[PDB]
Amino acid sequence: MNKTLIINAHPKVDDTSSVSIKVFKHFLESYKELISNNETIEQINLYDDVVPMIDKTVLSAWEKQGNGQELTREEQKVTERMSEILQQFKSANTYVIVLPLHNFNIPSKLKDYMDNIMIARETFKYTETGSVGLLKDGRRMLVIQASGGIYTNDDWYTDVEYSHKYLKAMFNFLGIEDYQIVRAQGTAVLDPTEVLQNAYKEVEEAASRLAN
Amino acid sequence: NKTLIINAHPKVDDTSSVSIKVFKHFLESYKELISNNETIEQINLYDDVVPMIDKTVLSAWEKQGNGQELTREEQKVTERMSEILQQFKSANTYVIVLPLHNFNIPSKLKDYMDNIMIARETFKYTTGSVGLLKDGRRMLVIQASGGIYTNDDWYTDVEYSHKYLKAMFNFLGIEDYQIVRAQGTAVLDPTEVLQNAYKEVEEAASRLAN
Ligand SMILES: Cc1cc2nc3c(=O)[nH]c(=O)nc-3n(C[C@H](O)[C@H](O)[C@H](O)COP(=O)(O)O)c2cc1C
Ligand SMILES: Cc1cc2nc3c(=O)[nH]c(=O)nc-3n(C[C@H](O)[C@H](O)[C@H](O)COP(=O)(O)O)c2cc1C
Ligand SMILES: [Zn+2]
Ligand SMILES: [Zn+2]
Ligand SMILES: [Zn+2]
């Protein structure tokens, strides 16, 4: 089965004033021109859809599920939603993450999302040596990130680009080694034309690559 | 002179939590050693209002930049965010308590970071950015983790919780940073983890109260 999952981590969701949403929408345009009829596309909007965070209730529920105790109606409701998010994630073999860079790390709701999809025995497992990803079946990820600064000049900025470093480390771990990030970078330093034209060109290439 | 405890544990107060036990041991030692004229404040991220960056916040910020009028909702959220910022700026000693969930800081702790990293307030675009909190402030992070992160292996390379916090607080001008790793809760006996962690926070308490 061929399914593409769009993980939209932008707080504005669909507002085209945003650089990363424009770039994504241009990606989506090219991608749909090129995919098969056998290819489904799903999207989760992290700032619009319900994405449960790890809280007392979730930790309590996960404790009980280890003992085999009964869950309260609240624990059932939140664990069920988290199961839907996990299974939706495992159901896809192409992923597109869209995010603005805010304070050198992933958006908080994207952290909640990671907390839903990094699940022992589901996307990774523990081993004698340590732990190992379970999603090693040729999946592909494209990250689209807009940023005010430039992160490819190998300087202090590069060193604190934790958003990219974390996402690549996490997904590489789960088994996704075909990874590309498109950085619509330098929005605070470069001509809007230059930033956008370069990011449109890059996601056009990505669409072509991902559609084969 | 004020100490600010930033509690990023979703369980808040539950002593089944290793990071909370270690914090409470720290706090009890600290309270014994500090002076009368010293205030301790605490914000519990999972039991308080810490605005996340959403549509409303972003729009409020754009309107503040265009000199446009704010809606009541935009007003209310930005007022709460400036209250959090000022509470953060008001303190010279900080304690962050967190469990390690998925190799990064808790999501509410990122929200908190988004409230306190503010231009012209805790840093300034300037030639480069510089921190405004360069007045000898101290930062203690108490972190509980299943794994061990001090062996200089793969685990060390993905400990983004510590790496991020240290980089952000250095950037704000807070260079006196110390992390207490109550680590190995997935491999060592719980009493073994606690004994070492308790000694670290007892020395931290003494050093910070001095
Ligand atoms: C609250 C906030 C925090 C930001 N933090 C960073 C940052 O840490 N590094 C950076 O390069 N740009 C930062 N920026 C600039 C944004 O990344 C830049 O405006 C980007 O174009 C936003 O993407 P978008 O247009 O899709 O929303 C920040 C902007 C805001 C509003
Ligand atoms: C959802 C979840 C994610 C976790 N992720 C990590 C991890 O990425 N690295 C690690 O060393 N331990 C991880 N752990 C183990 C916890 O860090 C460990 O249990 C720690 O003791 C929890 O802190 P606490 O006792 O203060 O709640 C995770 C635990 C849970 C429940
Ligand atoms: Zn287009
Ligand atoms: Zn309470
Ligand atoms: Zn024992």
Swiss-Prot record, chain B:
EC number: 1.6.5.-, 1.7.1.17
Catalytic activity line of the entry: 2 a quinone + NADH + H(+) = 2 a 1,4-benzosemiquinone + NAD(+); N,N-dimethyl-1,4-phenylenediamine + anthranilate + 2 NAD(+) = 2-(4-dimethylaminophenyl)diazenylbenzoate + 2 NADH + 2 H(+)
Top-level class of the enzyme under EC nomenclature: oxidoreductase
Entry keyword set: Flavoprotein, FMN, NAD, Oxidoreductase
The keyword NAD belongs to this UniProt entry's keyword annotation: yes
Gene3D superfamilies named in the record: 3.40.50.360
Cofactor or coenzyme needed: FMN
Pfam families, per database record: Flavodoxin_2 (PF02525)
Cofactor info, note text: Binds 1 FMN per subunit.
Amino acids binding FMN: S17, V18, S19
Domain of life: Bacteria
Alphabetical list of InterPro entries matching this protein: Flavodoxin_fold, Flavoprotein-like_sf, FMN-dep_NADH:Q_OxRdtase_AzoR1, NADH:quinone_OxRdtase_FMN_depd
Example GO molecular function: oxidoreductase activity, acting on NAD(P)H as acceptor
Family according to the record: Belongs to the azoreductase type 1 family.
Protein role: Quinone reductase that provides resistance to thiol-specific stress caused by electrophilic quinones. Also exhibits azoreductase activity. Catalyzes the reductive cleavage of the azo bond in aromatic azo compounds to the corresponding amines.
Subunit structure: Homodimer.
Name the record gives this protein: FMN-dependent NADH:quinone oxidoreductase 1
Source species of the chain: Bacillus anthracis
Gene name of this polypeptide: azoR1
